[PDB]
Structure formats: structure tokens, C-alpha cells
Design a protein around this ligand. Structure first.
Ligand SMILES: N[C@@H](Cc1cc(I)c(Oc2ccc(O)c(I)c2)c(I)c1)C(=O)O
Length: 236
């Protein structure tokens, strides 16, 4: 009834799923290696910042210590998608700076653990809503957790997530792009493959596809609130 990946789109999906899996911290068995950020950390948000806000700085350090590798992995992922590597250097850097939080956020959210109400950062650090609120995301902490809980139910697989990530990456909605039309063709290709792959999985949920497109908007929201700290160093 509802259409299902063409053979060129099965190819796209292999490449994208392998790019995601090869850059997802600790891989598919991440859950068996975790350290819970300890209780005494992230509880006291007392230090002002050059931006005006108060932050439990110890916590902010513990987070800042593991963020660069996480960024690196987003870049590794991007560079493994051929439609992304064909872009000019100038546009690659824009696009990366632009989705890097959208993607790290999604990457944590699908590793939401209802058993302990924690997010899992880079496959190892289990954190509570309040630790990451006080560590420097404000309300953004609350937004990712709501999303975590929301996705438990959708039960996404590494392909769905991979493809979701490519749709985030090839956004045409960024200041400064040269090759806008190429990016939109590629976004459209990924969207259409993704819609098809979702067909191919009979999801025991009504309206799965459109419900899931809505979480794109939530992720672009996250990325818009926490966009400052990405004048990151992209090396192509
Ligand atoms: N867990 C993801 C990676 C990931 C890593 C970290 I550190 C995260 O927290 C942030 C991000 C920006 C900030 O300014 C602060 I303060 C904390 C998140 I949300 C995600 C993965 O699987 O790659």
C-alpha cells in the first residue's frame, strides 16, 4: 500500500546507517558501560558567566571535558555521507556548526533510560535533568528529556536515527550557503527514503510518520537555543 524504499534508496540507507553506527559512542551495547555522574555534582548553580547566567561550574567542566570528542563524531558522521562531502568547504562548515547540537541532542535523547530517568552522554555518562540544567543548558535540559521520554515509545532503530540525523544536517535554513539547491535536493532525497523506510516498518502507532516529523521541529528548537558555543573548528 504505502510505498517502500527503491533500490537506490536502500543503498542510501546502508551508507547512512553505517555512518551513524560507526560514529555512535560505544556502539550498540553502550548501555552496559555507564558511570552515573555523582549526586553531589551539579546541585549548586552559583557562579556567574560572561553571558549573564549562573552555572554550577564543576558540572560545566565535567561536561565541557567530553564535548569535543562528541562534536568530532558528528563531523565524522557527516563526512561519511557522500551528498555532504560533495559540498564546498564553505557550506560544509556552515551546515556542521548548524546541526551539531541538534544531533548530539538527538543522540542523547534516544539513549534516555526510563529505569533511572537519565540521559546518557557519549554512551558512558548517565545524567539527571537537574545536573544538566545546572551545568549550562537551561530549559534546554528540560526539552531534551521530554524528547527522550517521548521517543521511548517510537522505538527507533539505528537507521531511523541515522536518517533523522541526515535530515537535520542538510537543512537549507542557515545564513550563508553557496549551493542551496544541492542541499535541498539531498534533504529531499533523505526525507523521502526516511518516509519510505518508516512505511517498511509497520509501526504499531497511528500517524507515526507525521508525529515523528514534529520531533524535527523540537530538535531545531534545541539547536536554536544553544547555538552560541558552536564556533567550533571544522577541518575541511
Ligand atoms: N550524548 C551525545 C553527545 C552529547 C554530549 C554532551 I557534553 C551533551 O551535553 C551538552 C552539550 C552542550 C553544552 O553546552 C553542555 I553545558 C552540555 C549532549 I545534550 C550530548 C552523543 O551520543 O554523542
Amino acid at each position: 500500500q504505502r510505498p517502500e524504499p527503491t533500490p537506490e534508496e536502500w543503498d542510501l540507507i546502508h551508507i547512512a546507517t553505517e555512518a551513524h553506527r560507526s560514529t555512535n559512542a560505544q556502539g550498540s551495547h553502550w548501555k552496559q558501560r555507564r558511570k552515573f555522574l555523582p549526586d553531589d555534582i551539579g546541585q549548586s548553580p552559583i557562579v556567574s558567566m560572561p553571558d549573564g547566567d549562573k552555572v554550577d561550574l564543576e558540572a560545566f567542566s565535567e561536561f565541557t571535558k567530553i564535548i569535543t570528542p562528541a562534536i568530532t563524531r558528528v563531523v565524522d558522521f557527516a563526512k561519511k555521507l557522500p551528498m555532504f562531502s560533495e559540498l564546498p568547504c564553505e557550506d560544509q562548515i556552515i551546515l556542521l556548526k548548524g546541526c551539531c547540537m541538534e544531533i548530539m541532542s538527538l543522540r542523547a535523547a534516544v539513549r534516555y533510560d526510563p529505569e533511572s530517568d537519565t540521559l546518557t552522554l557519549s554512551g558512558e555518562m548517565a545524567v539527571k535533568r537537574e545536573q544538566l540544567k545546572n551545568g549550562g543548558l537551561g530549559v534546554v535540559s528540560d526539552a531534551i528529556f521530554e524528547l527522550g521520554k517521548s521517543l521511548s515509545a517510537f522505538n527507533l532503530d539505528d537507521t531511523e536515527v541515522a536518517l533523522l540525523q541526515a535530515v537535520l544536517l542538510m537543512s537549507t535554513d542557515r545564513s550563508g550557503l553557496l549551493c542551496v539547491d544541492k542541499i535541498e535536493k539531498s534533504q529531499e532525497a533523505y526525507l523521502l527514503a526516511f518516509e519510505h523506510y518508516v512505511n517498511h516498518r509497520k509501526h504499531n502507532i497511528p500517524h507515526f510518520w507525521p508525529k515523528l516529523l514534529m520531533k524535527v521541529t523540537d530538535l531545531r528548537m534545541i539547536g536554536a537555543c544553544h547555538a552560541s558555543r558552536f564556533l567550533h573548528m571544522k577541518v575541511e
